[PDB]
């Protein structure tokens, strides 16, 4: 390791490449060749990757543990209040504006960010890193298990996605299949290469006042991989 250690600028660079390609330990040679990362030994980059994903896991487990203990308390207070309504001591058509049922609902619906600091770099998002790595590992294994000879034959079967009939172009189950084959080939966020691939045939259906643009495609991929893995339940 005579080329020096890993610093803040190399960290910022590793974080962006993971959000795009997932687990990147098998493509280190390619990321150095085009200047994305400066030259260090392969071992140093692998060890840093592992350390980052470990800090992300710990962060996510710690916050779930706290949320769960608070929800257990509010559920207990809510049970007591129900016996009061059924018996008449409080009246259902005349409840106080601040009550045990509104307190439970607020926490249940709460959406807050889960963040950590790494090697001088501040405010990395633990949930974004973990979801992206697991979603892209699922997509690679599904396609190699079933369509090894020719990825272009990939199909959704009877699994039925929510329609987008208000887009500018005509977008159906077949266009959803070609979009996921494109991410398997080129990475998350590579929308120009996906649009211009002549074999996928969606060149005229993407708009880089026209919808879909870059923001709509990102949201569509996050929804489709969550749904196939059973995450809507
Ligand atoms: Cl080195
Ligand atoms: Cl691209």
UniProtKB/Swiss-Prot annotation:
The 2 chromodomains are involved in the binding to the histone H3 methyllysine at position 4 (H3K4me3). There is a cross-link at residue 140 (Glycyl lysine isopeptide (Lys-Gly) (interchain with G-Cter in ubiquitin)). ATP-dependent chromatin-remodeling factor which functions as substrate recognition component of the transcription regulatory histone acetylation (HAT) complexes SAGA and SLIK. It recognizes H3K4me. SAGA is involved in RNA polymerase II-dependent transcriptional regulation of approximately 10% of yeast genes. At the promoters, SAGA is required for recruitment of the basal transcription machinery. It is found in: Nucleus. Present with 1620 molecules/cell in log phase SD medium. Component of the 1.8 MDa SAGA complex, which consists of at least of TRA1, CHD1, SPT7, TAF5, ADA3, SGF73, SPT20/ADA5, SPT8, TAF12, TAF6, HFI1/ADA1, UBP8, GCN5, ADA2, SPT3, SGF29, TAF10, TAF9, SGF11 and SUS1. TAF5, TAF6, TAF9, TAF19, TAF12 and ADA1 seem to be present in 2 copies. SAGA is built of 5 distinct domains with specialized functions. Domain I (containing TRA1) probably represents the activator interaction surface. It comes from Saccharomyces cerevisiae (strain ATCC 204508 / S288c) (Baker's yeast). Disruption phenotype: Decreased sensitivity to the cytotoxic effects of 6-azauracil. The lineage of its organism: Eukaryota, Fungi, Dikarya, Ascomycota, Saccharomycotina. This is Chromo domain-containing protein 1. It comes from the Eukaryota. Belongs to the SNF2/RAD54 helicase family.
